[PDB]
Structure formats: structure tokens, C-alpha cells
């Protein structure tokens, strides 16, 4: 692979970036995560939190608490769901793309296959097993066989696929973060129907995921104007140093910011700065290395907010509700708080991390801020 070597100047740059942006660093990283796609602020924030991840607590008796966040995106077509998957595949290390259907007869999980030329049985590993301690960008989640769903249940819950058929009793590690996207079965998403109805799947699978974003295609004139303007700006771009009319051949020092080009970045009175990809990768690695520890204030705030959230879910719920508020929301909030503490480079979680986690969770469930 490619070793991400660091120098003293790189560490100085990272420290300067942390100091100058002691606040709203999360906002800058979320905005700079994918510039081509317009909008989708909270989806980008959740993707960044997934990239950073959480912490795994192994208790004395041996029970293990998973520290990976899972995100699922259901909505209308032509809303750039797959583009986010491609950006995640291009940014995060150890990302394995799948088509949802599976890798030949192996499927998403592992399975035993015979050669049919000599009859010997070999254990071929699926995509989920291969991307251990990584990110799996499953696309078209609905196009999945029943056996794959049943196996995915256990794989996402325990994190250890167990195979004992054909006399081969073995257990493989599949601790992976799962980012999945899907399209409606009825062509257009019906808001009134429940997400399991629209996607055409079970409900426990929806319970496995931590966050559930519903991205609807809006036909407001202003939104269409802005999106069309951005698309045309991106499609008129010429890389510097190219003679006008040139065609691509198709052959067969760390920078904090990128050079400002009015076509791509947009002339927002030169008030917008976008961090380069290399800096993002190095910062994400350094953030991954750290392991924060929770404090009492965060625990109290999270407990009270969870109580209020569940009380608010008990009342109202007249309109379509994405998901019920079970006890898994507490685990999700803790993981998001740890992720934000990692991104801020602090080693102790405080109240602000819990506040950001609460905003994300409330937007994911109630679909409205606060």
C-alpha cells in the first residue's frame, strides 16, 4: 500500500490548523469534504463522523461494545447519493465497493464454494469480510437476497461471521462500517409510507443502522436554479495551463487550502476556503489515532437529552416517522460525541460534543432541527 509518512513541518501545519480553528473546525471539514456536490450539509457531517468513528470498550467479562457508525440514505433518484459513496471510496483508506447483490455466489458475507473441476471446497470471503476495520460502500441496498439479509443481521450485530457448515467450523472478523444507499420501489418516494415500505425491506434492518437520512427531490425554483448554476460552473472548468480547445490524452509541500478559482469554488467575495484532500486525509488519520475518554457532564447531559427525546417521541408522531426512538439512540449519541471529540483533537469529551451529537440525532430522526 501507500505509507502516509509525516514530517515535522506536517505536524506543525496540523497544530497550526487546530489552533487557528479551535472552534467550527467541524464545519470547515464538513464543507470541504466534497465540494462538487451542492447542499447536503448534515449528510456530509454524518459521513465525516463515520470516517472518524468511535471507541471500542472491551469490558472485564469480555463483552465488547462496537464503535462504528452506520449510515443509510433513502430517497428519490438523481439526487447524488452514489456520488457521496464514490467520494467516501476515494477518501477513506480500505474502502471496498459492492453492488448490493453480492460478489458472485459468495455474497456480501462469507460462504463456502466448491471448484466444480476437482470438487474441492474452499472458503471464499465476501466483501464484508474483506473490508475488516474499514468502510463498505454498499450501493442499491434493496437488490439483496434474503440469505444476505439474514446474514447481515448477525454480521452487523456481533461483528463476527460464524461458518460451521460443510464440517468447517470457523469464525471470521467482519468489524466494518456500512454506508448504504437505496432507491424507492414505486419509482417516486411516498412520504406517507414507512421507510421499510418504500425501500421494500424489513424493519429490524432499519433498526441496525444508527442514522437514517431521507433525501427528497424538491422542485422549488430557487433550488433548481442554484443546482443548475453549480453544475454548469463545474462543467465549464478548465485546468490551469491548458490551451483552449485541448483534449485529455487518456493515456493507456502540504497545502492547507486550495488555489481560489472562481468557476469551481465560486466568487463568494473570496470568503470561502476549501481544504485540500491530502490535508484532509492526514488530519483524519491523526484523529483516528486518538482515543478520548468521557466525562460526567457529558453523561448527565446525554441522559437528560435522551429522556427529553423519548418523551417528545411518545407525544406527537402524527406525521410520518422515520424510526422509533429505542435505547440504541444512547449508543449512537455516545459514538457521535466521541467522534466530535476526536475531530476537535481534544482528549476529554465535553458538553459541546454532546450538543453536536444531539443536533445530528434530532435531524436524523425528527427530520427537523431541534
Amino acid at each position: 500500500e501507500i505509507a502516509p509518512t509525516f514530517s515535522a513541518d506536517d505536524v506543525a501545519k496540523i497544530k497550526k490548523f487546530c489552533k487557528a480553528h479551535s472552534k467550527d473546525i467541524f464545519e470547515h471539514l464538513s464543507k470541504s469534504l466534497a465540494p462538487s456536490i451542492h447542499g447536503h450539509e448534515y449528510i456530509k457531517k454524518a459521513i465525516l463522523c463515520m470516517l472518524l468513528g468511535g471507541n471500542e470498550k472491551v469490558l472485564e467479562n469480555g463483552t465488547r461494545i462496537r464503535g462504528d457508525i452506520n449510515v443509510l440514505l433513502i430517497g428519490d433518484p438523481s439526487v447524488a447519493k452514489s456520488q457521496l459513496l464514490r467520494y467516501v471510496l476515494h477518501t477513506a483508506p480500505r474502502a471496498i465497493p459492492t453492488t448490493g447483490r453480492g460478489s458472485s455466489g459468495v455474497g456480501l458475507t462469507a460462504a463456502v464454494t466448491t471448484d466444480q473441476e476437482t470438487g474441492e471446497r474452499r472458503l471464499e470471503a465476501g466483501a464484508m469480510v474483506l473490508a475488516d476495520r474499514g468502510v463498505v460502500c454498499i450501493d442499491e441496498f434493496d437488490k439483496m437476497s434474503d440469505m444476505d439479509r439474514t446474514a447481515i443481521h448477525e454480521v452487523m450485530e456481533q461483528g463476527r461471521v460464524t461458518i460451521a457448515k460443510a464440517g468447517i467450523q470457523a469464525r471470521l472478523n467482519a468489524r466494518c462500517s456500512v454506508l448504504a444507499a437505496a432507491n424507492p420501489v414505486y419509482g417516486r418516494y411516498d412520504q406517507y409510507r414507512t421507510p421499510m415500505e418504500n425501500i421494500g425491506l424489513q424493519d429490524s434492518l432499519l433498526s441496525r443502522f444508527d442514522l437514517l437520512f431521507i433525501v427528497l427531490d424538491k422542485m422549488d425554483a430557487d433550488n433548481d436554479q442554484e443546482i443548475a448554476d453549480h453544475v454548469l460552473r463545474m462543467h465549464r472548468y478548465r485546468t490551469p495551463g491548458e490551451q483552449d480547445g485541448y483534449a485529455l490524452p487518456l493515456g493507456c509541500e502540504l497545502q492547507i487550502y486550495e488555489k481560489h478559482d472562481n468557476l469551481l469554488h465560486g466568487p463568494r467575495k473570496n470568503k470561502s476556503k476549501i481544504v485540500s484532500m491530502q490535508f484532509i486525509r492526514k488530519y483524519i488519520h491523526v484523529a483516528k489515532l486518538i482515543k478520548p475518554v468521557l466525562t460526567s457532564e457529558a453523561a448527565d447531559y446525554i441522559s437528560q437529552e435522551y429522556a427529553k427525546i423519548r418523551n417528545h417521541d411518545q407525544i406527537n408522531n402524527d406525521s410520518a416517522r422515520t424510526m422509533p426512538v429505542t435505547a440504541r439512540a444512547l449508543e449512537t449519541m455516545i459514538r457521535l460525541s466521541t467522534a466530535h471529540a476526536k475531530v476537535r483533537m481534544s482528549k476529554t469529551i465535553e458538553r459541546q460534543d454532546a450538543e453536536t451529537a444531539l443536533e445530528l440525532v434530532q435531524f436524523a430522526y425528527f427530520k427537523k432541527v431541534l
Partner: peptide
């Protein structure tokens, strides 16, 4: 610079040049 990495207990597991 590398001291700050040691401050957070990260220098031990960072690929130095």
C-alpha cells in the same frame, strides 16, 4: 512538534520520517 504528538499519546504510533 513531535512533543505535541507525545502530549496526546500519539507519537508512539505515528510514522516518523
Amino acid at each position: 512538534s513531535f512533543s505535541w504528538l507525545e502530549e496526546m499519546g500519539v507519537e508512539d504510533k505515528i510514522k516518523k520520517p
